[PDB]
Structures are given as C-alpha cells and as structure tokens.
Design a protein around this ligand. Structure first.
Ligand SMILES: N[C@@H](CCCC[NH3+])C(=O)O
Ligand SMILES: N[C@@H](CCCC[NH3+])C(=O)O
Ligand SMILES: N[C@@H](CCCC[NH3+])C(=O)O
Ligand SMILES: N[C@@H](CCCC[NH3+])C(=O)O
Ligand code: NA
Ligand code: NA
Ligand code: NA
Ligand code: NA
Lengths: 307, 307, 307, 307
C-alpha cells in the first residue's frame, strides 16, 4: 500500500545472483540482503531492470520473491516487478503476485519494443491496475523503451485508486511538474541515481536505486544532509557521487554493479545473455571509481539451464 | 537457406489478424495471404514486429506458422520470427521452429529493453545461430530497441555459416558499408519502406515491408523501374510513396495498416494491448493518403483470452 | 574583475529596445534599467543573445554600453558581450571595449556556424583573453551553436589568469563537474533560468537570466530561500517557475520577453529581422503564464536603418 | 539567373587560400580554379561555409569575387555567399554584389545563432530576395545553424520570382518532397556529398560540393553512370565514396580538404581562427582515405592581419 512505502527514501533495485552454470544463486541472497539492510536500503524492488528480469521466467521471479521474503521478514517493504510489454501477461502475473502476497506494490514498465501510443499506455496500465489487490507503480524510462508517458497521461493514471506511484526516468522538468500536480497518496521516485540529489531537493519521495548496492552510506549521508538543511554537505557529496554513478553505467547495467559486488565478495556472479560481464579492463577502473578498491587478476554471459 | 531467399525483393512482415475477443482470427489468414501473393509479395516474414509478436505466445506463433504454411503451400519462402531479448528463450524457440520445419530462415532482433553491449549482442546471436538447422537473419532496429549492432559486429556475425542476412533499419550510410563488405551467402534487406528506393539503388537485396500489405503493386512498379533502368519512373513513384509510408506509421504500427486492411474488407481486426487501434479521425486520413479511399465512420485494445 | 562579479546572483542579459523604424530606442533604456535594479538584478550583461547582438553593429553596441553606464552609474557591475564567431573581429572589439572601460568582464560565446574543434575553441578563447585588460567569461551553449566546450577544455581555459568565468548551458552533470574542479578566481553561472534552482543547490555562483526582466522578485525569493535553508519554499517557487520559463522561450527569445515588457509599458518594441515579434495568439498566453496578466489585443520584424 | 545555373551538376564551394600570416593568398587562386575546371567543376560557389566566410570581411569577399571572376572569365557560372544572420547586413551586401555583377545567384543561409521562427526566416529571405537584381538560393543546414526551414516555408519562398534554388542539407525525405512540389525555375541541390548519389536518383539538380575539390573525377563518373543508366557502376562508386566524404569531415571542414590540397601542392594554407588545421596524425589518415596518397613529415590557426 501507499502507507507501506510512504517513508521509503532509498529503494534498492535488487540484482539477481547467478551461478556460473546460469541458474539463480539463492545461497548468495541472504548475505546481499543483509548488506543492503546494513547500508540504508529502506525498501527493495525485486525483478526490476537491475535484476535482469528480461532473462528471468515468471516462475523464477516467484522463487526469488519467496527467497527474499524469507530473509527480509517484513523488515522493509517490497515492490515486485510484474509488468512486461504484453498486457495479458502482465495481468496474469500481477494476479499471481497479489495472490502470493507480501508485496507493498507491483512495478509495471512502459511497454518496450512495441512503442504504444499514450492511449495504449493508458489502457495497458489501467488493465494491470484493475487486475488485482496489489497497487501499481508506473516505470517511465524512454532511455530503455524509446516511448514515454507524457505527464498528462501519467496524472490521468495517478487518479486510479490502485496506482500509487511512479519511478520516473525522464527530465527534472517533468519531475517538477509531477510533484506539483500529483494527486493524494501517490509517490514520485526518480530511477536516476545521478539525479537523486536534484529530485529530492525538488520534493520527490526517494530513489529507486542501483548505486545503493555499493554506495548506500554516502547516498544516506546526502539525503540526511538535504533533510537537515546542510545543502553544502549534500552538494559536495553529489558532485563526487556523479562519476561513481557514471562508472556503474559505463558498461550495460548490472554488469558494473555485479563486478563490484563480486569484488566485495558477495558472489553476484555473471550476467545472463544477452548481457555479458564487464571486461577486466573496465572492472579495474569501475572498482577504483565507485568504491576506491584496488582490483587484481574475453567475457562470458550465461544461460538459464535448459534441463 | 540463402538460396531460398536469394531472389526475394518484397518480403511482407505479415500482420496477425485478431478476433474482437482477442483470440487469433485464423479464418481471415487465407484471404490475406492470397491478397499478398496477388500483389507481388515474394516472401513472407511471420511473427515480426508487424505481427504484434510481443503480444503473442510462442505456442500461438507455432499455430500461426502452421496456418500460413497450409495456405502458402510452398509458393513463396517463409521467415519465422524466433528472437526475443532472452537468449535462452530464443535458443529454445528456434530449436522448436527448426523441428517444425518449412522455413527458409529465422529472424532474431537485437535485444530490446536490456540494452546489451556489442559483445553481448555477438554472443546472443552466435548462440541462436549455433542452436539449430535454421539459418538466421539479424534484425537491427535502434528505433525500437535503442541499441544497435555496429557494421563491424554485424560483419563479424555475417561470417557465421548459419547467419545469412540482415534486416537493417539504421541509415543508408550503414547500408552502403554493409553492401560493400558483405561476405558471400549474405542478404541485405532494408526494414524501412521509405528507404526501399535508395537501398535498392545502393545494391540491397530487397525490403522486408509493412507497406506491401496495401501498396504492393506500386512498390513492384518502382522496383521493376529500378531493374529496367527507368530511374525517372522509379523516382516519381518514390516521391509519391513517402507520404504513404508516413501515414502507415502516423499511429503506432500495425494500427494504421490494420485500419486500411479492415477498410479493404480483410478482417485484420483490432490490435492487442498495449497497442490500441488507430483513432477514427486518423483512420479516414490514413486511408485517403495510403490507398486513396473514402472511409465512412474511443478505441479498444484487446487481450489474449485467459481461458 | 572576478572581485567585481563575485557576489552577483542574478545577472540580467539586457534586451535592446528598438523603435518601430528599427533604430535603437535609447529613450526606453533608463526606465528598463531602473526596473531591473528595483527587482533584484545585481549585475547586467550587455550585448548578449537576449540583446539581439547578432543584429547589432559593434558601433551600436558601444553606443548601448555608453547609454547603460550613464544610467547604471556604477551601482551594479556590467558585463560586455564581445565575442563573435570570428577570432580577429573578437580581438579587435574586446580591445575597443577594454579601452572604453567601465566593464567587470567580457562575454565570449563558443563560435557559431563554423563549428570549431576543441583546439579551435581553445586558441579562439586564448587569443581573446590575451588581447586586453578585460577578463573573459566563456559562454557555452550547444543549443545555439551546435558544438560545445568539453569540461576538460573549459578547465584548461579556466587556468588562464584573464579567464574568470563561464555561462554554462549544457547539463547539470557538467555543471557539477565544473563546480567540483574549478580553479580559484573562477565563476560558474548557469545561462538557463529553468536550471537556476538546481544549479544554485549544486554550488553555482548564480544565473545570467532572461526571466529576471519580468520575474526578478520570485527568482530572488527562491534564491533567498536556498540561502536561508528553506528548501521547501525554494522547491515550491521552482515548480511554479518552470512553466513561466517555458513560456518565455515558447517563441524565439527575446520575442516573448519583449511582448511582456511592452505589456508592462516599457517600450521594448519589436525585434530586428531575422527575428519577428511573437504572434498575437501567443502574446496573450505568454503574458497570462509569465506575469498573470490580462492582455487586450501578421507580425513585422524590423531593420537597422540604412541611413 | 536560373538559366545560367540550369545545367550545373557539380558546383564547388571554393575554399579561401590563406597565407601563413593570415592574409588571403590570391596568388594560389588561379591554380586551384584551373584544377577545379579540369576536374568537372561546372559551377563555383564563393564565400560559402567551405570558404570560411565567417572569418572573411565583406570587403575581402568582394576582393575574392574579383580575383576569381578574372580567372574564371565566364567559363562557368558563379554563386556568391551574401547572407548572414543579420537581415540588414545581408540586404546591403547582396546590393553590393548585384552592383558588382558577374554572379548567377546569391546564396543566403538560414540565420545562425539567433534561431528565428519560420515567419522570421520568411521575412529574412523575402527581404534579401526583394533587395537586388541578383536571384537567391536558400541554404538550409540545421547541422550548422540548429533551426531549419520546413518544406512548407521553403516552397512559399520558392514562389518568389527572385528565389531560384535551395542548397538542402536535411533529409532525403525532405529532398523528395521539394523535388515533387517544386515550382518552375527552381533548382534543388544537395549540400551533402555523401547524399549526392541518392539526391540525383531522387531527381535533384546537382550537388554543392566540398569533395569536388579532391574527388571531382569519381563524382562525375558516378553522375555520368546515373545519367547513362549504369546504376551498378554508380552504386559501386558511391559505396567507396562515403568513407572519403567521412574523412573530409573527420575534423572541422575545411581543415581536411585544405590538408589534402596542401599535399597536392595547391597552397591552400592554414585555416583562420577559430578554425585550426587538422592535426598531423589526422592529416596522414585523411590523405590516405580520400586520395590514396602517402603523407610524410600542435597546430596553429591564423588571424586576418590587424594592420
Ligand atoms: N524476456 C521477456 C519475458 C519476461 C518475463 C518476465 N521476467 C521480456 O523481456 O518481456
Ligand atoms: N512479450 C515478451 C515475450 C514474447 C514471446 C514471443 N512472442 C517479449 O516481447 O519479449
Ligand atoms: N551578425 C554577425 C556580426 C555581429 C556583430 C557584433 N554584434 C554575427 O552574428 O556574427
Ligand atoms: N563573422 C560574422 C560576419 C560575416 C561577414 C561576412 N563574411 C558572421 O559569421 O556572421
Ligand atoms: Na492513484
Ligand atoms: Na554467414
Ligand atoms: Na582563470
Ligand atoms: Na522562385
């Protein structure tokens, strides 16, 4: 519900650890979750982009939902990735997730590849929002799906009693407009780690983050500074935060974040194809920029076992 | 095989007709196919973007492949859409399609949403090409998938004995480079109807088309004129052809092409959500521009039956 | 000097009022200047983009510099627009301006139309900075000049003892990097009114503004709120400020700002060709959005007298 | 007049040779003109972009006009660059050029930097077209001036009795529309060397070229092949022509073309600031790609003498 997520500032879009053979590494999940909870993750998004959801089956996502719920144990609210570019598929899966329970919301992305019109988007998100007991957060990211929801269509959907938020990845101008004209019980999150400083100053509710995996402390430091009216401290952190964010996306995410987490000893493992791990040369630089670590010594993307 | 598709000039990316309830209209297929074959379609791509493949299940696509093969009866070669943004899913389906048989090639798109690197794309396509007997045509379209295969990576993949073509939707500069440096047994298609004229002049092998549904004759007249060294006639058709192509994409495809086909009486039906049919105001304009027709008059996207 | 401009927060890029015959309206200058100074303009840029400098002769600009200095009377520091896309022209004019005197700095834009390389830009700005006693503020705006100074080249130029600032119109990511790595005696201004809020929070020195003409008070209220740690008030003003900024650029600037100033009764007059005044339909909308005013009603761009 | 330029296929946008001290090298002009005339230049544009006109004074342009007219001696028609981003300046200069005589047309670019609206553009070009006896060709290039003329505004201007052409640098879709709906006695040239093949196939009148300086023969070869219905030959040349064009713009033009012309022994000299000569490393590659030459062994842009 909205009330469940209301106070969340740093929602982490959780990676999916994989074994070398391509199967999910469930054994690695507890250590990673505890790391997040020890580093100011106050909410967790499962089966998002960062989780490599395109390469996960719906049934694998349900197993992941179970594995994480067991560890988290109601300590922080959870959001489930439920939407695809197929409205029927999204409807059936959100029903399964609502039935499975334990989630504060379902995340549904603006459909990718098929490039729907504003009206298509409207009917897509209305159908998902109508489908179950689980409230919906809209994921708007033209950088990944080409098309984008206009703020006009967004606010029309925001009026739905079962749509309670947006993970907005467009412009700060758009961000400001949504904050200004938002209805009640509707949350506005940025999905852009580099913009979080600006988004929070603008009046956003938080960030749905990749960088909170590895830089949770300094993000909290920055957010605390903003909230405690120490703008000089917040800006200083932000200026130093930007190149770290940039490094985390200097190869297709979540390859960079997985490389750092592997270095930290968290067995994030490789990426599932079509994604490949970051090249060794990039890994050394990435680790140096993001966490100030010294990394030592072709890449292979993996496949979900066909047996 | 390459030999099967060698002489193709106009390959139609066939729509999927839907009933008003959301199920596939198999009844309407025989009439639509015969229409294409009577209007200079010399090859058919099934389960492409125009077919609304992202809203079709793999099982539904197999059912479509069966229905079309029964009607076509080997008259023209067929290409099956096999690729998704999930390499494992793509491997399993291309193996199913190869076993099903009766296809000249399989089309695999550059992965959408997850935005893989060049090395990601390479391993993705290599795995699909390694997977079965069915040769692969790569589908390169940054306009839908954000990322794109560079000509270098493209030509690396072209050297694979089981990769025999590309459906290129980038620029004419890229097309020229590819045509220049192509290996043997490799077909270069444009996936953009508005570029078909320039691509053919440049030395391309043909077009995988939406416009062939409704404007097959004038496309054939243009191509014939290019082949018979009547460039003035070719250019004349091209200059009048462009606003027709523009109309076909003035609402998210395949909405406009379905509208025209419905007007022509082929029961293409509505689109599946997240795509909605073209608005009534657009429908009249589109028909007037594309087929010089007079159309006599909220839209509803439909869903695959959950039963 | 740097010291003269150090404490500036809102620097207005002053318009050039024109008579209906195309000559400069020097009569209207005294009233417009006093208006700016009574509405929290703490510095004035003369002969900038907003002044329609490309349609002014160098001799006319000297006449403007004289008229403004007489009225201002040293109350606020002044910046002279000195740079064109011709390095020699720029050298000769900055030497004239330095000899004329009474300016805190000279503004030199990144050359337009000819699209120089980074090394071209470097030598361009170095020559202008070497040319005279007048320190230089670089004007970086790819939105008008296509090309842009990279932060690296920008910071190379910043090390020049006679380059003391930048008017940055790129992104907030670039702004942050520049603020972080700035040398001593170097001012960082945003030239984008809609970014002023985020730039100030990020640590920028101020704004060189169009909006200050008509909305100086609320900009000062916003800046004061940023300075007094009242971020909620600041963000509130910002969110309402953005559609006002958008209106000011809804027709090629300075057409919209001149329309408002004419409505306010300052005889800003028309624009010089190739710029035309804002259309009557736009004028009413713009005034309503920007200054909440009720406007009671072919446009004509005017020419500098050939006599 | 239109009749003067009607049969022109390859119009060369002539460079301006400079001495090391920054002054125009008039001594170098005769050799270059003869080279052009010996290599299928059938018309010459003076004081265009390639001429580095932004760095030339109007009085220098008149001297260049005289120097070239003396050498050419009516052998080929000439077009003069007369337009700036200042309508009054453009009006006064076209009057001087019409009075000076010897030109078939004046070229006027869409105003740069000030980003006028369609109406501003209309009134700008109407004023220039109204000003003198010399007919006008519109230069539409958003790549250099940001803004662009819509085909609608272009064709409105095309109806002016004293506007007889366009140097179009947008898209081939736009190119086709203009060719289709052109009025009588109106010429359509591409200003994009890489597009010339496509433009000519589409029905354009010719190219206003940079590459004709160094690759005049193969362009003529290509154009002859198109005109003689040998499309295979024309395409083969085009595919090999593209990387040569690309090399000619791999550093800000006309630096690359000047480097090749200096290698050919034509004393093109350096570029005037803000443009700098191509770096030695680029020069070696450029010469190899464009003219298959082997080049042997910081850069300095020059300034027009201030004495
Ligand atoms: N790979 C498909 C299916 C995703 C299934 C749920 N994770 C897609 O990206 O849409
Ligand atoms: N909707 C998913 C699955 C497609 C299944 C095959 N048509 C996707 O676009 O990737
Ligand atoms: N119109 C020319 C000359 C400007 C003269 C100084 N205002 C240009 O924009 O470069
Ligand atoms: N440098 C100025 C003046 C050009 C004078 C004629 N070549 C401009 O680019 O507009
Ligand atoms: Na709601
Ligand atoms: Na191959
Ligand atoms: Na300095
Ligand atoms: Na005309």
């Amino acid at each position: 519900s909205y009330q469940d997520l209301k106070e969340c500032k740093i929602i982490t879009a959780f990676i999916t650890p994989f074994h070398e053979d391509g199967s999910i590494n469930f054994d690695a999940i507890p250590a990673l979750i505890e790391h997040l909870l020890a580093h100011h993750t106050d909410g967790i998004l499962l089966a998002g982009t960062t989780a490599e959801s395109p390469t996960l089956t719906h049934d694998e996502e349900l197993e992941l939902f179970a594995a994480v719920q067991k560890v988290v144990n109601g300590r922080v609210p959870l959001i489930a990735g439920v939407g695809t570019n197929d409205t029927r598929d999204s409807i059936e899966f959100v029903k399964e997730v609502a039935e499975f329970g334990g989630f504060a919301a379902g995340l549904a992305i603006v459909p990718y590849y098929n490039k729907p019109s504003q009206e298509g988007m409207y009917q897509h998100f209305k159908a998902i929002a109508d489908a179950s007991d689980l409230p919906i957060i809209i994921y708007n990211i033209p950088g990944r799906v080409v098309v984008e929801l206009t703020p006009e269509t967004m606010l029309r959907l925001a009026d739905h009693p079962n749509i309670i938020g947006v993970k907005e990845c467009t412009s700060l101008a758009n961000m400001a407009y949504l904050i200004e004209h938002k209805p009640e019980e509707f949350l506005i999150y940025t999905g852009e780690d580099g913009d979080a400083f600006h988004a929070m100053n603008l009046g956003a509710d938080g960030v749905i983050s990749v960088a909170s995996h590895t830089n949770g402390d300094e993000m909290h430091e920055m957010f605390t500074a903003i909230a405690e009216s120490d703008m000089k401290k917040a800006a200083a952190i932000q200026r130093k935060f930007i190149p770290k964010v940039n490094a985390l996306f200097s190869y297709p995410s979540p390859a960079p974040v997985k490389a750092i987490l592997n270095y930290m000893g968290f067995e994030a493992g490789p990426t599932r194809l079509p994604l490949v791990p970051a090249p060794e040369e990039d890994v050394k630089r990435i680790i140096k920029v993001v966490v100030d670590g010294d990394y030592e010594a072709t890449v292979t993307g993996v496949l979900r076992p066909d047996y």
